Structure 1
Amino acid sequence: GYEPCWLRYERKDQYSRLRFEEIVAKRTSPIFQAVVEELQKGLRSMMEIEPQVVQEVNETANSIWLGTLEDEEFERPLEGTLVHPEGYVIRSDVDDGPFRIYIIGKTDAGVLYGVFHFLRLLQMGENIAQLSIIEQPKNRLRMINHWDNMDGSIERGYAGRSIFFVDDQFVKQNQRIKDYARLLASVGINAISINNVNVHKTETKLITDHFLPDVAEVADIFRTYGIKTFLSINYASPIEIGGLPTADPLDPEVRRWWKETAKRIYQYIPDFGGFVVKAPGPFTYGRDHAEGANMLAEALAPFGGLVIWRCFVYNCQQDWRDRTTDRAKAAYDHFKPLDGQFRENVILQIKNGPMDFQVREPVSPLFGAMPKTNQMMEVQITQEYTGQQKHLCFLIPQWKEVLDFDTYAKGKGSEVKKVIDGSLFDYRYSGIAGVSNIGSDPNWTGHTLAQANLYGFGRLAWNPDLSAEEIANEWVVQTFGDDSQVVETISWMLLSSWRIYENYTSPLGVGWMVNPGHHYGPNVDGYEYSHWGTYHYADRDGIGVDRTVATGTGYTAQYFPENAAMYESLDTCPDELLLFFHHVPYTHRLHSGETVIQHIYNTHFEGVEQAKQLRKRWEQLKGKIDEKRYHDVLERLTIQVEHAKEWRDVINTYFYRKSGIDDQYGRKIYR
């Protein structure tokens, strides 16, 4: 009913197989059961072998050994260096007897990730004769956030309906949930919130006895795949379902209500992860976010639960007339002052940028500014402002730019990745979360190639140091095979896609210029006079938001001195973010040599030609990809080309109508 995505386990030819007679499973836990089944599935499908599962090594059999450090009958130096619970070592026995592969994890979860790594090597056709691998994830929390609603809809979902809910109830078919867990575990994802951060009427009841049995059934599946389950909660629950007159976090009964709620949840789900919170709320009663988050943290504390508090807070009622108020400054001004006031099990979840997942946004100043408060970054896998899976947009390159951004919080070498992996400030709980891009569609992600974004998110979550090139390579090979043309072509498409999409959408980092509401397609003035604080200020002479300290909102001062100075200066501010930081004349000359207005025309005309090239390159792969997927993607690429033409012309015409400056190259701009 649906695709296996990157876990194809395609049958190998007669010259690429392995000889194994047994799988030695040293443990019988639920996770080990799933681990063994996955190994059996992979070996059967790829190698056409069915090794017997045993609990003790056969001295003369070729085997794959699965176990933890305590199960070892010696313990070599390599695995001895393992300190992370989810870490593992994979090594081939150096002796000259039977062939033995040892997958040693610090804990059961480690064995799971180790087996998926082993299977990845097999799918990639790597030589496993002399393996010596040690892997430990950099981020403690590698999470997925679902924006699924219980009526089946998914907020900002472009890949079909929810696979969890339908008709305000849980789906009765859990097989797809198991396969989803397999996909998530294959890339190391260890945490998931199953419901929309915008908690509506029915969803508010997920923390009650009426739905907890179903939530537990789902959590049971995820647990076997090393994934902790979380629920997004309605801060007003005490009122809506608690029967209390207030939701004030300082009200004695409200505090008690949440403690009892936590206790109730843990009776159903002993290892419940905690709550994801989008915040009647704290401010409603004059309380700050520390007071609001700490109350929930205290309820979960005795049970080891975590409170994931989203920092996506700003004035959703800003006056477009007031150029002194800057939405981009909101998150930092709200949370920076609260550093050191949060309980230890509270993690502030901050979007990669200070605005709202635009094609390009500078890094949120909050990263590196709160040494005493756990932080985790939230990225959006679903392409809300990046093509909505109609346009191709491999998000990994962008995420790496964010992760590798040096905040200089503690001098050079204070990259965002070091902030969220917890090494820079010694955070007890930290990591990264991604807004799911899946749905009921057979190909899971709407656009077949968007499967690469989910896979890629997991890879970066595990190790931010992985290159975009190798992640793309891994995904393409596992999903489409090793034909050099197929690999090179699809890898190029993925690696080039983000820049291509940015080229014909919003210019030089100013963002937006999208249709209000659904957010798909060009509409330069869409939110220009709205109350959302998302303005470009384009007029007949220039464009851009002055965020400088010298003459603007002073947003640049939120960064540490090194980056603040870079953006503050009109001369040093990078072209790609120029309009986010400075208001400049259309004739302003960029580092590229292009005037701002000509840059707009250039990238929009040229971006469409690049999109046409994406389609052309794909068409050249006909015959090397199964017809179904070939046409599924071709269909989307054609949709992309046609819509790109709309983006190009709408933006070019809008700016020609305002600037009065013609295209240097005389290309077609409709009057």
Structure 2
Amino acid sequence: AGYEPCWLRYERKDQYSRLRFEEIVAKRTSPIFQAVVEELQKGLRSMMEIEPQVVQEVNETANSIWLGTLEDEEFERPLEGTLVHPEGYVIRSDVDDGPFRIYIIGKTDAGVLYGVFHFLRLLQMGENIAQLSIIEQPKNRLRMINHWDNMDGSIERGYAGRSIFFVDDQFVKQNQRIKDYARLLASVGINAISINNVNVHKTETKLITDHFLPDVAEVADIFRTYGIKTFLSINYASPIEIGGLPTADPLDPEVRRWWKETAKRIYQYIPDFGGFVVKARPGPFTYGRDHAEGANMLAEALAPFGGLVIWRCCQQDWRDRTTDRAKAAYDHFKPLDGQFRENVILQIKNGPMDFQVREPVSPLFGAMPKTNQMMEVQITQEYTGQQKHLCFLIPQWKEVLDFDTYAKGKGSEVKKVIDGSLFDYRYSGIAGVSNIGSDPNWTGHTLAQANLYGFGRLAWNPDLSAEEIANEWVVQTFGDDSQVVETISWMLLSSWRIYENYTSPLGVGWMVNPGHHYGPNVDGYEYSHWGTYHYADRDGIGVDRTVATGTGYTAQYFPENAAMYESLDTCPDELLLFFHHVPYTHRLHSGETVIQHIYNTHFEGVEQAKQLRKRWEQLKGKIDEKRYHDVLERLTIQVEHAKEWRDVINTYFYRKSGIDDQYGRKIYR
């Protein structure tokens, strides 16, 4: 009772929306099967007020829900016969005229778990299940969540409370919330999780030692029952820090042995350990080694056990416009294609910079046919409102996933790159930086729950529309009142564009306060060593990334996209300032001058934020008071901060451009 059930409400149905079932046939007794049966019992009891008896053999005359794998079937029907994916499943209603039977057939126990959550999802959404014929197989092998939780309880870039894993440099004593968290993750198909910050500090470095492994294993045991593999972010300098060795050089014989022994030790506690997430003071480059050498060493240590190495892909001068941070990732990793071991997967952010409200797609996707790749997206809203401002990230992620790289001609969308189909990747997928914390509503902003849900849905099937994902989430979280559904869906679907409207313009990004990264500060990092510049001056703004006159970044894309961005007239408006430096008077495809566009979206974005609040207020009475006010409080905070964003950006550019707002709206001198 300390936290919300999020989208797994299982609200009691009226007398006209019940189902008649007397038994649940559980064909297996595995740990996963016990959790799945429990979940099914929980949902049916809560929603239908029924308590079917769990049995292991079907009763020919009872209405039942059958749970099992192909191997448990008496007759293997054609549909489930086409399943090839281990986590896939089939759900079909028996077509006989006798007892009502629902068959949930999974290729493996994991498949049954996801099938049962799909079945429950159908019930929460009020779907007619009299004649089901469903087949589902996830597109991404890895559907992972990265936690930036520290063991002192803090969470790097965490805006939803303290960690639910650690406290006072120890694991929390009560694991009930970890179980409920596992349930939420599994309901949306998430099958992997790294429980600690990628920036591994002193105490966290010890997670790979006997001192903490027992607690790590207890947590992994919980996730295992929900089909989730556990990973740990590691400190590359561990051999020195805790091993006593004089070096961390991946080529040093003893360092290689140390990691092999460490791997062996971990698997003694966690037989199905997922592997290591790596952000590499000492490191590969510290010894003149490349990423392949550094990643392959860890890969070799985990190989005998089936573990994976997730290798995630800073003192540059603002004075030199020839150097471009956006080009770094590609320039550093592309040349390494083909040198990585099979169990190494390069983790690349959606964009080449750092999770800005809008960034073009990282050129690395589609550029390394011989190297597994998985995309990293940020669920926690570091540069997208920090859960103060509403920002449904699903539409943005779909734009990235559907981006055609043309790597192998038309039809080489990012999603085909990371789902492994385009290049036959053995291991690949997508990862998301957790947006949860100890807050009772899990995500700080009640509506941010939609981003966690949505992440899982896209990870399972990138082809799902933003519209249906929002619909599913709203209906399960707030009910089916058509006004509530339409209003909240509209809020979610338009939120990202609204936030972008009053923040950084036309894809140039940043313009945020340094450090905490919250709020407007146009020149915040403009003269820093982070390579994040907009180069705004009294005549124009933008980064010239063209080959003709700029950094040449455009050439990292394949011909079709390179030419699109390379040209000043074809470059889409939404990314113009990321690719070209232009005069304030330059006219966009929309007809607006760059400067007037800035004023327009900032004034209008605030008005759109006020509308978000107005529409929510009109739902009062149709939502419980607690959550109604929890969200209203944040929408009001959003409106007020949006005003600051608007005025600071408008004033900065009026002071620099000297050009007034076409409509004479209020710009403070």
TM-score, structure 2 as length reference: 1.00
Deviation at 1:171, TM superposition (A): 0.1
Task: Give SS of 1:643's match.
Answer: helix
Cα deviation, 1:178-211, whole Å, max 9, x if unaligned, reads 0000000000000000000000000000000000
Distance 1:537 1:284 in 2: 33
Cα deviation, 1:254-311, whole Å, max 9, x if unaligned, reads 0000000000000000000000000100000000000000000000000000000000
Distance 2:252 2:319 in 1: 38
Task: Give SS of 2:526's match.
Answer: coil
Percent of residue pairs identical: 100
How is 1:104-123 mapped onto 2 (pairs within 5 angstroms)? 104-123=105-124
Cα deviation, 1:494-517, whole Å, max 9, x if unaligned, reads 000000000000000000000000
How is 1:508-519 mapped onto 2 (pairs within 5 angstroms)? 508-519=506-517
Distance 2:337 2:432 in 1: 24
Distance 1:567 1:530 in 2: 26
Deviation at 1:330, TM superposition (A): 0.2
Distance 1:381 1:246 in 2: 36
Deviation at 1:394, TM superposition (A): 0.1
Q: 1:284 is matched with which residue?
A: 286
Distance 1:301 1:52 in 2: 44
Deviation at 1:349, TM superposition (A): 0.2
Deviation at 1:78, TM superposition (A): 0.2
Cα deviation, 1:146-168, whole Å, max 9, x if unaligned, reads 00000000000000000000000
Distance 1:489 1:281 in 2: 50
Deviation at 1:252, TM superposition (A): 0.3
Cα deviation, 1:527-558, whole Å, max 9, x if unaligned, reads 00000000000000000000000000000000
Distance 1:3 1:305 in 2: 34
Distance 2:537 2:249 in 1: 45
Cα deviation, 1:123-158, whole Å, max 9, x if unaligned, reads 000000000000000000000000000000000000
Q: 2:333 is matched with which residue?
A: 335
How is 1:381-400 mapped onto 2 (pairs within 5 angstroms)? 381-400=379-398
Deviation at 1:464, TM superposition (A): 0.1
Deviation at 1:368, TM superposition (A): 0.1
| Structure 2 unmatched ranges of 5 or more | none
Cα deviation, 1:11-61, whole Å, max 9, x if unaligned, reads 000000000000000000000000000000000000000000000000000
Distance 1:284 1:17 in 2: 64
Q: 1:65 is matched with which residue?
A: 66
Task: Give SS of 1:66's match.
Answer: strand
Distance 2:284 2:658 in 1: 49
Deviation at 1:590, TM superposition (A): 0.2
| Structure 1 unmatched ranges of 5 or more | none
Task: Give SS of 2:568's match.
Answer: coil
Cα deviation, 1:67-110, whole Å, max 9, x if unaligned, reads 00000001000000000000000000000000000000000000
Deviation at 1:338, TM superposition (A): 0.2
Cα deviation, 1:574-616, whole Å, max 9, x if unaligned, reads 0000000000000000000000000000000000000000000
Deviation at 1:462, TM superposition (A): 0.1
Distance 2:586 2:233 in 1: 46
1:268 aligns with 2:244: no
Distance 2:616 2:285 in 1: 52
TM-score, structure 1 as length reference: 0.99
Task: Give SS of 1:378's match.
Answer: strand
Deviation at 1:639, TM superposition (A): 0.1
Deviation at 1:323, TM superposition (A): 0.6
Distance 2:174 2:660 in 1: 58
Cα deviation, 1:325-372, whole Å, max 9, x if unaligned, reads 000000000000000000000000000000000000000000000000
Task: Give SS of 2:246's match.
Answer: coil
Distance 1:229 1:194 in 2: 8
Q: 1:422 is matched with which residue?
A: 420
Q: 2:352 is matched with which residue?
A: 354
Cα deviation, 1:376-431, whole Å, max 9, x if unaligned, reads 00000000000000000000000000000000000000000000000000000000
Distance 2:527 2:170 in 1: 40
Distance 1:564 1:341 in 2: 27
Task: Give SS of 2:489's match.
Answer: helix
Distance 1:350 1:631 in 2: 38
Task: Give SS of 1:134's match.
Answer: strand
Distance 2:336 2:536 in 1: 36
Deviation at 1:570, TM superposition (A): 0.1
Deviation at 1:645, TM superposition (A): 0.0
Distance 2:58 2:306 in 1: 37
Distance 1:579 1:493 in 2: 27
Deviation at 1:458, TM superposition (A): 0.1
**Count of aligned residue pairs for this structure pair:** 667
How is 1:556-595 mapped onto 2 (pairs within 5 angstroms)? 556-595=554-593
Task: Give SS of 1:23's match.
Answer: strand
Distance 1:324 1:292 in 2: 29
Distance 1:44 1:625 in 2: 23
Cα deviation, 1:197-241, whole Å, max 9, x if unaligned, reads 000000000000000000000000000000000000000000000
Deviation at 1:460, TM superposition (A): 0.1
Distance 1:605 1:439 in 2: 33
Deviation at 1:434, TM superposition (A): 0.1
Cα deviation, 1:424-448, whole Å, max 9, x if unaligned, reads 0000000000000000000000000
Distance 1:97 1:643 in 2: 62
Distance 1:364 1:258 in 2: 31
Deviation at 1:454, TM superposition (A): 0.0
Distance 2:353 2:245 in 1: 35
Task: Give SS of 1:272's match.
Answer: coil
Distance 2:366 2:665 in 1: 45
Deviation at 1:117, TM superposition (A): 0.1
Distance 1:323 1:662 in 2: 29
Task: Give SS of 2:666's match.
Answer: coil
Aligned counterpart in structure 1 of residue 470 of structure 2, from 472, 475, 479: 472
Distance 2:622 2:661 in 1: 41
Cα deviation, 1:556-577, whole Å, max 9, x if unaligned, reads 0000000000000000000000
Moved over 6 A (4+): none
Cα deviation, 1:647-668, whole Å, max 9, x if unaligned, reads 0000000000000000000000
Distance 1:516 1:198 in 2: 19
Distance 1:374 1:566 in 2: 27
Q: 2:195 is matched with which residue?
A: 194
Task: Give SS of 1:418's match.
Answer: helix
Distance 1:329 1:379 in 2: 19
Task: Give SS of 1:89's match.
Answer: strand
